[PDB]
Amino acid sequence: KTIKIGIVGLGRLGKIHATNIATKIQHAKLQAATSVVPAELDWAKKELGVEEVFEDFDDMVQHADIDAVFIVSPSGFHLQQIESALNAGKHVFSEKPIGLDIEAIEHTQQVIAQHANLKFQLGFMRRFDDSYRYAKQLVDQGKIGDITLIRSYSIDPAAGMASFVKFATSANSGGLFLDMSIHDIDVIRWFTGKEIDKVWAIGLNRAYPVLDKAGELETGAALMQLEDKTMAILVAGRNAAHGYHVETEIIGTKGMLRIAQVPEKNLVTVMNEEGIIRPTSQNFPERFAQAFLSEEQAFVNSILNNQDVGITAEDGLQGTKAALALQEAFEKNDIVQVAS
Amino acid sequence: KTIKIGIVGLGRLGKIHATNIATKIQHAKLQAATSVVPAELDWAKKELGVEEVFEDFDDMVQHADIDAVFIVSPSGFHLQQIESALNAGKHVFSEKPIGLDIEAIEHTQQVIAQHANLKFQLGFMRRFDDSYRYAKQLVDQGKIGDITLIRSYSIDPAAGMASFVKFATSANSGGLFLDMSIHDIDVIRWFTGKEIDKVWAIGLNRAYPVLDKAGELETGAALMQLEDKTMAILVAGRNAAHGYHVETEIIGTKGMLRIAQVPEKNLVTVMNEEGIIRPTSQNFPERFAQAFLSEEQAFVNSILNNQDVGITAEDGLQGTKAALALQEAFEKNDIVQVAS
Amino acid sequence: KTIKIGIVGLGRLGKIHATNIATKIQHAKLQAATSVVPAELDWAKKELGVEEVFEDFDDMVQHADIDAVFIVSPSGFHLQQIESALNAGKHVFSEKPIGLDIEAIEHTQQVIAQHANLKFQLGFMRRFDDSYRYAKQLVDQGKIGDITLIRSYSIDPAAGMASFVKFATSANSGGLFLDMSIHDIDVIRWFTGKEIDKVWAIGLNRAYPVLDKAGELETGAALMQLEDKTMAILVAGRNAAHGYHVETEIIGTKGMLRIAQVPEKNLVTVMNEEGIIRPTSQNFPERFAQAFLSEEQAFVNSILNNQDVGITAEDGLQGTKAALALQEAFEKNDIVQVAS
Amino acid sequence: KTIKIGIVGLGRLGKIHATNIATKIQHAKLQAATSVVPAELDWAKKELGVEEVFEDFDDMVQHADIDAVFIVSPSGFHLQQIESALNAGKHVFSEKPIGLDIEAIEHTQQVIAQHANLKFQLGFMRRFDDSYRYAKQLVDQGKIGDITLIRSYSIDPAAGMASFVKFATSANSGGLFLDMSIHDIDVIRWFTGKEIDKVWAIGLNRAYPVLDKAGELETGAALMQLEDKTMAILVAGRNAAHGYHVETEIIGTKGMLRIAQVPEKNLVTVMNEEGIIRPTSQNFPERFAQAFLSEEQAFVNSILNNQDVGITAEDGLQGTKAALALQEAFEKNDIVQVAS
Numbered sequence A, B, C, D: 001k002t003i004k005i006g007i008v009g010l011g012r013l014g015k016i017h018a019t020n021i022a023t024k025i026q027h028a029k030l031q032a033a034t035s036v037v038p039a040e041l042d043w044a045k046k047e048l049g050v051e052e053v054f055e056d057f058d059d060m061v062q063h064a065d066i067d068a069v070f071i072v073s074p075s076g077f078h079l080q081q082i083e084s085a086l087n088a089g090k091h092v093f094s095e096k097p098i099g100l101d102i103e104a105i106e107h108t109q110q111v112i113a114q115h116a117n118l119k120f121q122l123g124f125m126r127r128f129d130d131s132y133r134y135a136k137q138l139v140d141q142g143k144i145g146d147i148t149l150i151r152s153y154s155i156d157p158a159a160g161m162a163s164f165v166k167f168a169t170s171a172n173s174g175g176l177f178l179d180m181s182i183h184d185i186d187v188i189r190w191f192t193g194k195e196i197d198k199v200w201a202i203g204l205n206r207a208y209p210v211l212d213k214a215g216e217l218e219t220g221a222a223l224m225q226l227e228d229k230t231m232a233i234l235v236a237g238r239n240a241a242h243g244y245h246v247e248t249e250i251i252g253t254k255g256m257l258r259i260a261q262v263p264e265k266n267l268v269t270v271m272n273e274e275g276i277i278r279p280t281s282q283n284f285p286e287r288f289a290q291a292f293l294s295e296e297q298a299f300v301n302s303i304l305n306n307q308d309v310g311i312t313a314e315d316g317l318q319g320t321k322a323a324l325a326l327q328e329a330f331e332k333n334d335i336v337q338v339a340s
């Protein structure tokens, strides 16, 4: 039949997932919707046709006619919400990060384990991106030999700095590497099958020095050594002049590849007095639209066919963990072991 | 609130539209199907859950519980099936070209006129393509000035040679200019708002002699002059070694642009002993997947909203007319006025 | 040893060649020079080290210690100046076109053949271009199979429009197709080994109203059929907004190539709010600096080795002839046979 | 007048410098050559017309008829050869790196200062590269704002692996960082005007067993922090499957640029069954041919015109200083300070 879904969270990404499930995802019905903001639930109802609205997640979980939940609430809320819906026997989708505190994660990683009758999936959608999957297949086919180095760039567009400042001046966290680099960590683990041993990170505020006063970072770089001495390089950022730069390079013994060497918007190339111009993708909903739909449909399908997707809490744990180590290494300006 | 659709044709493109309608197109349901190949209908029943199968189009429109038809039969059958379905009070989507005979088209267009309450939409899917649309927007905003020249390439992949030969020998395709270049003719018309005045076409078979034996042209080239002296160049063919080469260049007074200068498959760049490699899109279902989906949903949405899409019988007529002039100019090896 | 060379003509291109021979050309020596200028030669005199100034090739070729001339005088003067030096017993380099009147050209062709001890070289410099040569080697190696179509663009930069008008309004030379398209004709003959049978050309002025006033063509396009039904497409123009667009595409039975698909200036890529930008080459001395140098040196080496370069009067003849055929097809707006 | 030049070293690069000097460089003559390989000196006599040959450097500088020397001997021999040539009254060009020991360089630095009337130029040829100069121009013109990060890759071709092993096993190279990464260090300094504060470097051998045997690193990666907190990333290696990968990326407050994002060979694009192919430059002689010529002529002109080029022992010392730090960091696998 049709998988009834109650979503929690209708911010930036909530609205995308909401809209997709409602209108694009087959075998799916967006039945419930939770938010502490009434306007969103009114948008939910008088735009997507949502039936049961709530202001408390558990309220949604106990009374709603749903089989599964999409957790698109802020990070600090994920772990209790995952435990809570599993306890109510819901299948669970949670956005990244899985959570912030390791202990809690380790704890939730068993609740999920003890509910092996329920599907759990984490929102590392890059795993579903056609381009990443294309490369992943090349690597698995042995087309570049053995991986020696991965470089991954995740830089937010400068058009977003305005609202990042202001926000940064009103609130804090989760930090540059926990916001931007955790997808890269997962991409690194996915491709190599290895784990990260130690990291060093540096950072710089140069476009907007005021970020020094707000305890935030505009640009960051890191070097990592994996457990098998495979090398990794990261850049994270918030000030990309050209758009949304997410690029992943993989160097091997027999070749080399790059996924979005440049963030090509489409098949159009423009020529004018500037020279040869290629328009670019501008933000994550644009760049990763396809990936979001594919992860959404994967979840549903994993429930109907009783099949594991393969993105586990362990992947969530190690993501958050390595992210934290980058942050710590930045603060200390020194090398940090991930296991500590 | 839900459109039951009957499709005729389940071949190279028929199987795509069907699959799309049954599984991805909202407020639509693939209710019926028609094909002269029994294995295909078996496939519709089993894999797509299609209710009603027929081997006669006239039979489907009379007896199926449908609200609309998708015409994906070979080109020589289009006009008969449009009129029939119209006369049966069903909404009509027809693939290109609209027909192969001008006289018959004119007649069909007047039948469409009597039924000014039924929707008619032609399958010039390029108008729905994200990249083409983007370029259109650019041109509309004045980014390249006024158009001076359009060059358009539409070249089928060498790897599809066998499947083409089967298509080409199972029914009249109308030839290279009517089967391929008609997309380009429509693009030129879409972009300039002008009509083609006179043309000269040349051709050549050099790679695949089997095409001659099927009376099909392997590679064609043409020069066209529009009514306002806007210039245009076309190339069509059946032998692109690298994949599906569909490219449109628009030259203007203040710049120029190219749509799929090269048929980039994705965001993956590969580097090895051959050099820098970009994988390519391989065929129309891959390249134009999005477009096909968009035109399908636009067709369906037009029925529910009672508003026209703008791809008209007149666009079909004028396309076919120019295509026939290219064919004629090819046969005569001389300039031909579209007026004749 | 050292080849002693005298040059006639020292304007836009003349100053390039002379400056090259003096300073970068090996086993060669600039000695003589001639022009309608005391000036420009006033320039030549001082910071080139030009000893001898004249106003008559004949006057100039009379007293000088040289083995050879290098003809960079205007079109009309080539031939008469060609025979004179051969009448003087010198080896000869001349620029394109070889001349402008067919019967005249056919005459000189008889002469050159009668001085089978002397070197005659024509300045189709694209033959010495590293990129053109690379493509030629690929084609000759069978990498693309047999050539079915060649498309060639030669569009001058819009930034050069005022200097063009200045140049043109005061001294005609010699039409668009004859000025721009002749290199492309020569490239087509070079790669194919074939000759052009019939052509049709059209044209448009839309961007720069001064060209109307000057009686010049802004953009032209042409289709050509070669003697073996090999296809060819040409565009020439004066309004390339992005730079100097000289591109040549070669489609074959097993592949296709593009020489300067876009005119990349260097290895630098720029990324900003416009998107991804490739700076471009701006004019012919930039783009073909290497070619010009290589043709100068080949000529010299040709003397020293007594070995013929292979760019003949016949290549000159067929170039002007095809260019004249294009010009006539533009004027008449009909197909023209090259043999007329 | 003519600068009589004597060269030491006729290996991988020495044969190129020699050939250029004798055949391409104005106002210069390759009078003398020194090498520990007799077959090499013959080749100079037979092929380049070198009058005086030697097996010992001191020998050449005492007894040859020269004004200046090019030092292209292995790196551990540079400093003693610079000093010896200076004492003998000769101008000096030395290849990179200037030396391998800091105290020695400081001493050689003081010797250069005592002969301030003689020219000293170090062979950081990238400073002369047209594409690097263009990027430097853009940066100086504010086109990308202030520099936040430089990533630089220098990865030798896998095809050159045999020639490398000969080079590395015949004399001490100094390791990957002193031999390769030093170019990038200089670029970072040239662009930023700042010095490197601290580094961490890691490394891996995975493809070619000979390298470990020869005590060489196959691929290295490094994070550096400069004195003003400007970030830097390095990768160097000996196993690039696609060609010679020398790439330099500059990230800024207002934009970003890439020098040789990929090492495009020329203007030719190839299209076939593998997709879209760009051929690549294969090795240093190819990629930096122009640079090498420019620095040679710059050296020679500096002697004739008595104007300093501006690439100094201090540039040498600061580069060797940072490279050693990288080496130590690699060996210890921990952060190192350049000062201490």
Ligand SMILES: NC(=O)C1=CN([C@@H]2O[C@H](COP(=O)(O)OP(=O)(O)OC[C@H]3O[C@@H](n4cnc5c(N)ncnc54)[C@H](O)[C@@H]3O)[C@@H](O)[C@H]2O)C=CC1
Binding pocket: A008, A009, A010, A011, A012, A013, A014, A034, A035, A036, A037, A040, A055, A056, A057, A072, A073, A074, A075, A077, A095, A096, A097, A123, A125, A284
């Ligand atoms: N997959 C990806 O690439 C990305 C994932 N994320 C993850 O997004 C989650 C959503 O982020 P945003 O939409 O940007 O945040 P947000 O602030 O934009 O929206 C949060 C949603 O929070 C709901 N919410 C807040 N407190 C709640 C509560 N106590 N109970 C129920 N709902 C509550 C808000 O009302 C709203 O419904 C985070 O895990 C974020 O990191 C965000 C961006 C990208």
Ligand SMILES: NC(=O)C1=CN([C@@H]2O[C@H](COP(=O)(O)OP(=O)(O)OC[C@H]3O[C@@H](n4cnc5c(N)ncnc54)[C@H](O)[C@@H]3O)[C@@H](O)[C@H]2O)C=CC1
Binding pocket: B008, B009, B010, B011, B012, B013, B014, B034, B035, B036, B037, B040, B055, B057, B072, B073, B074, B075, B077, B095, B096, B097, B123, B124, B125, B166, B167, B170, B179, B284
């Ligand atoms: N928009 C586009 O890019 C494309 C459009 N097309 C158009 O789609 C149409 C279908 O082409 P393909 O699918 O390649 O052809 P095909 O040869 O693969 O399939 C034809 C289908 O029509 C059926 N058919 C044949 N004669 C029939 C009749 N008298 N009554 C009912 N059904 C009949 C066959 O059973 C088969 O199912 C053509 O007009 C073609 O021009 C095709 C490919 C791409």
Ligand SMILES: NC(=O)C1=CN([C@@H]2O[C@H](COP(=O)(O)OP(=O)(O)OC[C@H]3O[C@@H](n4cnc5c(N)ncnc54)[C@H](O)[C@@H]3O)[C@@H](O)[C@H]2O)C=CC1
Binding pocket: C009, C010, C011, C012, C013, C014, C035, C036, C037, C040, C072, C073, C074, C075, C077, C095, C096, C097, C123, C124, C125, C167, C284
């Ligand atoms: N190979 C190529 O791609 C190119 C070839 N050319 C050709 O090179 C030649 C020079 O063209 P431009 O430099 O553009 O011309 P220009 O406009 O610079 O004039 C060139 C020179 O011709 C001289 N001249 C004019 N009338 C003369 C006369 N009666 N006797 C002696 N000298 C006279 C002028 O003094 C001037 O010094 C032409 O044949 C031109 O078509 C030009 C551009 C590119």
Ligand SMILES: NC(=O)C1=CN([C@@H]2O[C@H](COP(=O)(O)OP(=O)(O)OC[C@H]3O[C@@H](n4cnc5c(N)ncnc54)[C@H](O)[C@@H]3O)[C@@H](O)[C@H]2O)C=CC1
Binding pocket: D008, D009, D010, D011, D012, D013, D014, D034, D035, D036, D037, D040, D055, D056, D057, D072, D073, D074, D075, D077, D095, D096, D097, D123, D124, D125, D166, D167, D170, D171, D179, D284
């Ligand atoms: N700027 C650049 O991009 C490049 C710089 N280099 C630098 O140039 C230098 C030469 O490297 P390669 O030519 O690759 O080395 P190589 O090993 O290919 O050539 C060495 C040459 O030096 C001679 N030689 C060795 N020991 C000698 C001694 N004690 N006295 C006199 N001659 C001696 C050998 O006979 C041979 O002719 C190195 O310092 C290297 O770092 C090398 C290649 C590229």
Ligand SMILES: O[C@H]1[C@H](O)[C@@H](O)[C@H](O)[C@@H](O)[C@@H]1O
Binding pocket: B156, B179, B180, B183, B284
């Ligand atoms: O029918 C033709 C269609 O118009 C094209 O888009 C497609 O590429 C061809 O294969 C079809 O024959």
Ligand SMILES: O[C@H]1[C@H](O)[C@@H](O)[C@H](O)[C@@H](O)[C@@H]1O
Binding pocket: C155, C156, C179, C180, C183, C284
């Ligand atoms: O003489 C023309 C030359 O052939 C072209 O290449 C160039 O672009 C034009 O400026 C010249 O007029």
Ligand SMILES: O[C@H]1[C@H](O)[C@@H](O)[C@H](O)[C@@H](O)[C@@H]1O
Binding pocket: D156, D167, D179, D180, D183, D284
């Ligand atoms: O000495 C190294 C030089 O600096 C590089 O440019 C070259 O690529 C290497 O092969 C050399 O060893």
